[PDB]
Amino acid sequence: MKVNPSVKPICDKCRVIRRHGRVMVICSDPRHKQRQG
Amino acid sequence: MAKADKATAVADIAEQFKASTATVVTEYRGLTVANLAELRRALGDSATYTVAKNTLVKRAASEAGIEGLDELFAGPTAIAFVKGEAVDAAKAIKKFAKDNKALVIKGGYMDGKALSVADVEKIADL
Amino acid sequence: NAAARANDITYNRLIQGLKAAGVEVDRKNLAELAVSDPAAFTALVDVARAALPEDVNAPS
Amino acid sequence: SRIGKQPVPVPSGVDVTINGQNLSVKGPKGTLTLDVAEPISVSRAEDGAIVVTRPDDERRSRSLHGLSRTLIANLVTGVTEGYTQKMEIFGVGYRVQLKGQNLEFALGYSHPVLIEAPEGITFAVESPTKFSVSGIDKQKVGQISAVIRRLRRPDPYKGKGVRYEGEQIRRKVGKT
Amino acid sequence: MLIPRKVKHRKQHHPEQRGIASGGTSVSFGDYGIQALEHAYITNRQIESARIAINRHIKRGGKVWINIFPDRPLTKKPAETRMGSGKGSPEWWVANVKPGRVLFELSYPDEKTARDALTRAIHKLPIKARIVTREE
Amino acid sequence: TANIPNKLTANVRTRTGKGASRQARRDGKVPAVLYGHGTDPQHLELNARDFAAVLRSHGTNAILTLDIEGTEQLALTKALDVHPIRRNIQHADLLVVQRGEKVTVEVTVLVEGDATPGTLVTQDANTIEIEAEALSIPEQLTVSVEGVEAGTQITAGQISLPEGVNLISDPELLVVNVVEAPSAEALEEEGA
RNA sequence: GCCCCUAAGCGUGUGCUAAGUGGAAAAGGAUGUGCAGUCGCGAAGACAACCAGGAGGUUGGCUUAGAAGCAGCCACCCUUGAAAGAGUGCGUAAUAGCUCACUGGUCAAGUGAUUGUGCGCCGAUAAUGUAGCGGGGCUCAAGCACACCGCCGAAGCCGC
RNA sequence: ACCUCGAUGUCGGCUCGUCGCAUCCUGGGGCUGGAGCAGGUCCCAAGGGUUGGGCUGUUCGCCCAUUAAAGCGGCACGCG
Ligand SMILES: [Mg+2]
Ligand SMILES: [Mg+2]
Ligand SMILES: [Mg+2]
Ligand SMILES: [Mg+2]
Ligand SMILES: [Mg+2]
Ligand SMILES: [Mg+2]
Ligand SMILES: [Mg+2]
Ligand SMILES: [Mg+2]
Ligand SMILES: [Mg+2]
Ligand SMILES: [Mg+2]
Numbered sequence: 033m034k035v036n037p038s039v040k041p042i043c044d045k046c047r048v049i050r051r052h053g054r055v056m057v058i059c060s061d062p063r064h065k066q067r068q069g
Numbered sequence: 070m071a072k073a074d075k076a077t078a079v080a081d082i083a084e085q086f087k088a089s090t091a092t093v094v095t096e097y098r099g100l101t102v103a104n105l106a107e108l109r110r111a112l113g114d115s116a117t118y119t120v121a122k123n124t125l126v127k128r129a130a131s132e133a134g135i136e137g138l139d140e141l142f143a144g145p146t147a148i149a150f151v152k153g154e155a156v157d158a159a160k161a162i163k164k165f166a167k168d169n170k171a172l173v174i175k176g177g178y179m180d181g182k183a184l185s186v187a188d189v190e191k192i193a194d195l
Numbered sequence: 196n197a198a199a200r201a202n203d204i205t206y207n208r209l210i211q212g213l214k215a216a217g218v219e220v221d222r223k224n225l226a227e228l229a230v231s232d233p234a235a236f237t238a239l240v241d242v243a244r245a246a247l248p249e250d251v252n253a254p255s
Numbered sequence: 256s257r258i259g260k261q262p263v264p265v266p267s268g269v270d271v272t273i274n275g276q277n278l279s280v281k282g283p284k285g286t287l288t289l290d291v292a293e294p295i296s297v298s299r300a301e302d303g304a305i306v307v308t309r310p311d312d313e314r315r316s317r318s319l320h321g322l323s324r325t326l327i328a329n330l331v332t333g334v335t336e337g338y339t340q341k342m343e344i345f346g347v348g349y350r351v352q353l354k355g356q357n358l359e360f361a362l363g364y365s366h367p368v369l370i371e372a373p374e375g376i377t378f379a380v381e382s383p384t385k386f387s388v389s390g391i392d393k394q395k396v397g398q399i400s401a402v403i404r405r406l407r408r409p410d411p412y413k414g415k416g417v418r419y420e421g422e423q424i425r426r427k428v429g430k431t
Numbered sequence: 432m433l434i435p436r437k438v439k440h441r442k443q444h445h446p447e448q449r450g451i452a453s454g455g456t457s458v459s460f461g462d463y464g465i466q467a468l469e470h471a472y473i474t475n476r477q478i479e480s481a482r483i484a485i486n487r488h489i490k491r492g493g494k495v496w497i498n499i500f501p502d503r504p505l506t507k508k509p510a511e512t513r514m515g516s517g518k519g520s521p522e523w524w525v526a527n528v529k530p531g532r533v534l535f536e537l538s539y540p541d542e543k544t545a546r547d548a549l550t551r552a553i554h555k556l557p558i559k560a561r562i563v564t565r566e567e
Numbered sequence: 568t569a570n571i572p573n574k575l576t577a578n579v580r581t582r583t584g585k586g587a588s589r590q591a592r593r594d595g596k597v598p599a600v601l602y603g604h605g606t607d608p609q610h611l612e613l614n615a616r617d618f619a620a621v622l623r624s625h626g627t628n629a630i631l632t633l634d635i636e637g638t639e640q641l642a643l644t645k646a647l648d649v650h651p652i653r654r655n656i657q658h659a660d661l662l663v664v665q666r667g668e669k670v671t672v673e674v675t676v677l678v679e680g681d682a683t684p685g686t687l688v689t690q691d692a693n694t695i696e697i698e699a700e701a702l703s704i705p706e707q708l709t710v711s712v713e714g715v716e717a718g719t720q721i722t723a724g725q726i727s728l729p730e731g732v733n734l735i736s737d738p739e740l741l742v743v744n745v746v747e748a749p750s751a752e753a754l755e756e757e758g759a
Numbered sequence: 760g761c762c763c764c765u766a767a768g769c770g771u772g773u774g775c776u777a778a779g780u781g782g783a784a785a786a787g788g789a790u791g792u793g794c795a796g797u798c799g800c801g802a803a804g805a806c807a808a809c810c811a812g813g814a815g816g817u818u819g820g821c822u823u824a825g826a827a828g829c830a831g832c833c834a835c836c837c838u839u840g841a842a843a844g845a846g847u848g849c850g851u852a853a854u855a856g857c858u859c860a861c862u863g864g865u866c867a868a869g870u871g872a873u874u875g876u877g878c879g880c881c882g883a884u885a886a887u888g889u890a891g892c893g894g895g896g897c898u899c900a901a902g903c904a905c906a907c908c909g910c911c912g913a914a915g916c917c918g919c
Numbered sequence: 920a921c922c923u924c925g926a927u928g929u930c931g932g933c934u935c936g937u938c939g940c941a942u943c944c945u946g947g948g949g950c951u952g953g954a955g956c957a958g959g960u961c962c963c964a965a966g967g968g969u970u971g972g973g974c975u976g977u978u979c980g981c982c983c984a985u986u987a988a989a990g991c992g993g994c995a996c997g998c999g
């Protein structure tokens with residue numbers, strides 16, 4: 033969980049979604065999953 | 070590709086079909102590029118082997134009475150033109166299909182009528 | 196405002212209609228009447244609605 | 256929305272009853288009920304199709320149209336045929352077995368693990384290494400699948416734990 | 432580390448920073464440039480870091496133009512000193528930038544890494560800025 | 568080299584001044600002035616969106632037709648102002664030009680090609696002044712370099728030009744410069 | 760200022776807001792949402808998905824113990840052609856494999872990108888007790904944007 | 920230098936606590952260059968606890984021996 037205000041689609045496959053007003057990026061690559069907070 | 074590209078592809082197929090004696094459409098599905106190249110080299114003495122968009126060939130088919138084969142393009146379709154005689158490429162395709170087990174002959178065109186796979190086999194035997 | 200809302204009209208509309216009708220009676224006498232004669236308010240609200248224009252949101 | 260434009264086919268051996276906003280499905284495998292969102296309406300086409308309609312082109316209608324269509328399609332297809340999810344228990348000293356309606360897992364813990372089976376779900380064991388679950392509701396089937404899967408923490412080194420049929424976990428090793 | 436060789440007077444009042452930049456509003460030395468948006472004090476160390484960033488990414492080809500020069504000085508007294516008793520010594524030289532002024536200019540073939548390097552420079556400046564091309 | 572005119576509609580200004588001009592700008596219309604050798608300057612309003620679209624389509628310099636209460640005018644976009652921040656249009660100068668006249672035109676130039684490993688690309692001059700006919704104005708100029716080595720200074724006068732165009736700029740102007748590729752030592756030495 | 764504490768519109772017409780934003784704040788980040796202006800492709804079938812193809816010179820040279828499309832450096836050439844990119848990567852010492860790029864089959868119209876915009880979300884963590892709308896409460900705005908009609912409102916003005 | 924010079928008593932120690940969380944442990948999670956233990960880092964979390972001594976007036980700090988830790992700060996540098 034790399035918690036940082038700026039989140040980007042690091043690889044070509046990381047995907048950004050929206051949850052409870054917090055947008056977080058999810059990828060099958062484990063570290064590519066983070067939240068912005 | 071562009072609209073001009075589609076138009077020139079249709080045109081090129083038109084002169085190719087007009088200058089060819091007969092045509093056959095087969096299924097390239099499940100055929101490795103290696104054996105496809107081998108088949109092309111084997112049939113390159115007389116015939117030619119290419120592929121094209123089903124809808125593009127459908128539009129190109131309105132010029133002649135080959136409109137009856139439009140129902141046969143449902144599924145992968147590879148079109149071959151027999152510039153020299155008729156039976157050589159048909160027999161080559163038949164033996165390739167029976168050897169590889171993954172190629173299916175959809176049908177062929179000859180004498181102005183659309184004929185089924187059994188008739189393809191019969192004329193290739195002839 | 197209490198009396199106007201009892202008679203089914205707002206204070207601002209009642210005052211504007213009263214001014215349009217040109218009645219110069221003051222809030223002292225209106226309040227004493229509200230304590231006193233609902234007949235007087237019935238007549239007054241009738242006059243106010245009669246003097247009220249057709250559309251309140253006209254650009255005029 | 257785009258899928259919602261496509262009506263849901265209804266098989267012959269399925270009975271559907273609708274009363275206002277509540278909807279129910281009658282079939283050989285059982286009965287199920289759901290309630291749909293207020294702003295949108297659903298209708299029964301006379302040719303054996305499910306028609307769902309949204310009143311406007313706004314956000315809520317656009318979203319809920321496809322939700323309703325796919326939920327009804329899943330409901331009717333599960334009620335007619337059904338749903339099976341099978342698991343594989345890979346590892347050493349890992350034992351699974353079924354008694355009655357309950358399930359017992361020997362997952363290496365010092366104490367045995369027992370899970371109570373909810374209503375409307377069935378379990379069947381084929382091998383002590385892999386079993387399957389059968390049911391009618393995708394909700395309950397997925398709930399059980401997740402509950403079973405969360406017994407064991409992820410193991411990216413040795414593959415210890417539980418997983419589905421096609422689930423793949425990446426392999427990684429340490430030199431030390 | 433852009434510092435003027437010599438200045439006639441070594442201390443200057445607080446500069447005015449009002450209005451919209453008139454000079455150097457359009458980019459013409461190369462093809463691509465960066466235009467600022469807000470009022471700011473841009474320092475020589477910031478210019479050095481931005482130029483290092485631009486070259487550090489553009490590598491072999493291309494070259495850089497800089498349309499500003501940090502020659503305005505600023506003073507600062509050291510801490511633990513009562514205020515007054517004269518002016519402090521000048522510490523860093525700054526270049527006052529007005530909105531819309533062109534900061535850096537680039538001339539490299541391809542849009543991809545051209546915009547990439549310009550953004551690399553953008554991320555090191557303290558104020559908002561945008562890419563601008565030679566075409567109006 | 569032949570071009571086609573661009574059609575647009577325009578209206579004459581009602582009020583003149585900073586307030587009226589800024590009100591029109593807030594509305595979404597750009598004020599413009601039409602003056603020329605006809606000894607009859609005019610001030611008009613244009614559509615910002617259509618003007619920007621035409622500018623994007625036909626570059627900085629295009630030949631334009633003006634519709635003033637149904638009247639047809641032939642004019643050239645010669646000078647203009649652009650906002651430093653909003654990158655919008657605030658003023659443009661339109662010069663009436665008839666067919667068969669000599670005008671001074673500034674045109675942008677582009678450079679393309681493949682460079683050798685020891686070649687550094689440099690472009691000092693990007694706009695040159697060319698005298699040509701109104702309907703023969705080119706939109707862009709291209710130059711090609713292939714296998715350039717050492718000193719290969721490209722001269723503006725050396726650029727090939729179409730027929731009917733005159734080079735107002737002196738031949739001493741240089742447009743493209745090719746020198747040896749830089750080194751880390753020189754890069755770290757410069758600026759210190 | 761006009762929902763109540765408190766006097767006046769739980770006023771009218773047209774739009775935005777889901778955050779109690781309104782009712783503390785930045786760099787920066789995001790398939791939040793509304794408007795306007797574009798271009799590419801799209802009934803000659805787009806975009807996504809779901810079967811197949813994705814090799815022969817070819818292990819391209821230097822470098823290395825090692826370099827085979829995937830430490831690194833140079834053309835980044837070429838053939839069957841539908842398309843092979845000196846390969847975007849997660850793969851092995853190095854091979855070999857999983858792939859992918861462009862392309863071909865079914866379905867059947869929107870699919871992308873920057874552009875200027877009004878609101879928004881995160882970025883947000885201090886000490887006695889809410890404590891950053893005055894409070895209750897307010898989106899079934901009592902918030903914001905634009906017009907219209909009115910009212911309350913001082914010792915200001917007018918009347919005696 | 921805005922309140923206090925017709926008076927706001929000052930550092931440390933003893934007793935006595937209180938509050939915030941930027942958390943020392945205990946509690947729950949994400950990732951690893953986390954074979955296992957043993958780790959590193961980030962998030963949520965203030966319920967509870969948070970050594971005794973030698974030295975110096977000390978605060979601080981060094982050293983001696985454990986425990987889960989021997990928290991950071993605010994409260995007129997808490998409190999005559
Ligand atoms: Mg000047
Ligand atoms: Mg900045
Ligand atoms: Mg009060
Ligand atoms: Mg009241
Ligand atoms: Mg209302
Ligand atoms: Mg109002
Ligand atoms: Mg409205
Ligand atoms: Mg919030
Ligand atoms: Mg606020
Ligand atoms: Mg903000």
Ligand SMILES: [Mg+2]
Pocket residue numbers: none
């Ligand atoms: Mg940004």
Ligand SMILES: [Mg+2]
Pocket residue numbers: 813
């Ligand atoms: Mg492929």
Ligand SMILES: [Mg+2]
Pocket residue numbers: 819836837
């Ligand atoms: Mg080669």
Ligand SMILES: [Mg+2]
Pocket residue numbers: 831
């Ligand atoms: Mg290499």
Ligand SMILES: [Mg+2]
Pocket residue numbers: 874875
């Ligand atoms: Mg936009």
Ligand SMILES: [Mg+2]
Pocket residue numbers: 892
């Ligand atoms: Mg309030």
Ligand SMILES: [Mg+2]
Pocket residue numbers: none
């Ligand atoms: Mg009044």
Ligand SMILES: [Mg+2]
Pocket residue numbers: none
């Ligand atoms: Mg008074």
Ligand SMILES: [Mg+2]
Pocket residue numbers: none
């Ligand atoms: Mg007076």
Ligand SMILES: [Mg+2]
Pocket residue numbers: 920921
């Ligand atoms: Mg003082």
Ligand SMILES: [Mg+2]
Pocket residue numbers: 922
């Ligand atoms: Mg005082």
Ligand SMILES: [Mg+2]
Pocket residue numbers: 926
């Ligand atoms: Mg005293």
Ligand SMILES: [Mg+2]
Pocket residue numbers: none
């Ligand atoms: Mg005291």
Ligand SMILES: [Mg+2]
Pocket residue numbers: 928929
């Ligand atoms: Mg003291």
Ligand SMILES: [Mg+2]
Pocket residue numbers: none
């Ligand atoms: Mg915390």
Ligand SMILES: [Mg+2]
Pocket residue numbers: none
């Ligand atoms: Mg823990």
